[PDB]
Design a protein around this ligand. Structure first.
Ligand SMILES: [Mn+3]
Ligand SMILES: [Mn+3]
Ligand SMILES: [Mn+3]
Ligand SMILES: [Mn+3]
Lengths: 199, 199, 199, 199
């Protein structure tokens, strides 16, 4: 079982004018493609190392596995979090959980925006689900470090704040990108990840 | 004594076609300007905190100080490392030190290139001077973490590999940026930092 | 400011047989004492660096300030968290907050124990208060990194799991130390810190 | 592979009075033993994760693999670095390499001592070999992070400065432990590791 680059559920230009086709094409077809290939390359090296019990080689490979493995996980989620039919507000139990845990939908937007803009360097802003406490929680992750593997939280909604995610369009003004991305959020997908946690 | 944004020693377009004016203008007039202002803001908060002995406030501010303080230091060095009259190879004692410590000028280029391309996320590649051992040394730093404050090495030549340093021109192909930047290296300035370490 | 080593609120042997007098004496009069002395030394150097605008020197000092500064913060709270009159269970609003957020007092005990035993290397287990969410939260911190300065949580109860906190008595068996320490928790102080977080 | 706890090359009390038998026995039969058992447990979980392509699970396991894996690597070298027949100074090519790279044996001793005493929290001091530059190098590592896996340096001589390595005998006075340990260094083994690095 090899990992593969998933096809995008929409055309590269489907999110215009909020995210233009050139960013989407570069972000998906160059960046994500590289993470999955290097993940596959890295897993073969680690697979060899684990069989020989070469702990030094296993440990030397951990950054490459985390970096490329996280990149694959994160972008694969990210594409599903966006939709040309998205935007607006969530409904039903997710909306009620957000009001419950954050006060209002607007306060949640403020807190996730603040977490994303506050990332020093490259990283991600997340809405996550805390299985232990049974409530929603906002977290930020550096580089391509994935949410669940490093915090235990189930990822619901991720915001890529790597400069390659917005720079061609918004240059250094990260707040403009965060403002625009709310217009294409696929709350149906966010809701489906959330409902899968509860039973 | 307040920190200030230094003027560039050349026109925004002086490094064309290797680095185009739009990157230089954005990199200097937006990014660097923000680091120095936030550094000044952060120092006032810390200056208050240190007077009251509020250790919690001092510690809470450390990331902001390191991030914005490093950004100011790094870019201020970076501008001097580039020149429209640069490129080529160094001469004199610096050239001899490089052959001595790295084998050849081309091997040094390979090693600094590899360190820079290998940065996962945002960071810097450096040629530094090890005062303790008295030789040259290559190091990589994450985000805006400055070389001397965190490693003890004296910075000689820095390569900004933040995506805002190349993405508008070279997109995701960081190796193309590293190849081009060798054409505008100010070896005179690199030499002057190096000679200041020796006595 | 010139920080000072606080006097202990009890005799070094007051917690026997749960924590023996030699640990308390070494932990207070040698270990804590060293952090205070080095904190004062570190703060003096930092004040000079800030006056000259030496950003490099400020950044070089951050590990010593956080480590020794945190050590002072952490132990000063820790001593107030213990009492020969301690142990048992809390009452009133703190007990109700624990039931709300953790289910029961026993489950809180199990989770804080797990957080403390799970620390890899040197560090601390904490019960803290999250002002943003208005609930209790368990956290672990590495080395002497202090809870509030690095996480924003208000410390209520801290467990030092540096080996110097137990090794003379409990050797490598950290669970025995954790089981014993519940017997000397000053729940009256934990209650006062919690009430101070509320309006 | 199924890693195993290595037999000690000497009696637990063979290094008295420099390192007492109780530390050696606890350090070998409890501390090292725990790393091996948890390493085998951790490797089994990782093999399953790799088979299912569960990248999240692979990443969640990295801290346990590095910590317990490094603990096995580090202590296995450490035991071979000590000998009742040890102490004194090295001879031959190792002694000459030290003079070349550090000036004198005494200065090497001062610097490795400083590197070991300067570790904040748990960790190790190392003399290592840098294959790239072809010279000796002093490094410190946190917790059980292993030298070669995280830095690329070949370990020659390691100093465990976890408190469990000295506290029963030397209490908080790490310099006394460091001064004493020179008396039991197996320079014959250090020499064999160094020669193995050369062609
Ligand atoms: Mn991305
Ligand atoms: Mn830059
Ligand atoms: Mn302590
Ligand atoms: Mn040990």
């Amino acid at each position: 079982m090899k990992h593969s680059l998933p096809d995008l559920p929409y055309d590269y230009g489907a999110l215009e004018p909020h995210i233009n086709a050139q960013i989407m094409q570069l972000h998906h077809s160059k960046h994500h493609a590289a993470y999955v290939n290097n993940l596959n390359v890295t897993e073969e090296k680690y697979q060899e190392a684990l069989a020989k019990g070469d702990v030094t080689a296993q440990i030397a490979l951990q950054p490459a596995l985390k970096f490329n493995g996280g990149g694959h996980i994160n972008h694969s989620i990210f594409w599903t979090n966006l939709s040309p039919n998205g935007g607006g507000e969530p409904k039903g139990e997710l909306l009620e959980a957000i009001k419950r845990d954050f006060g209002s939908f607007d306060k949640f937007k403020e807190k996730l925006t603040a977490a994303s803009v506050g990332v020093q360097g490259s990283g991600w802003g997340w809405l996550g689900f805390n299985k232990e406490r049974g409530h929603l929680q906002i977290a930020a992750c550096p580089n391509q470090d994935p949410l669940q593997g490093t915090t235990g939280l189930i990822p619901l909604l991720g915001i890529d704040v790597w400069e390659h995610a917005y720079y061609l369009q918004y240059k250094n003004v990260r707040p403009d990108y965060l403002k625009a991305i709310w217009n294409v959020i696929n709350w149906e997908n966010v809701t489906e990840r959330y409902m899968a946690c509860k039973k």
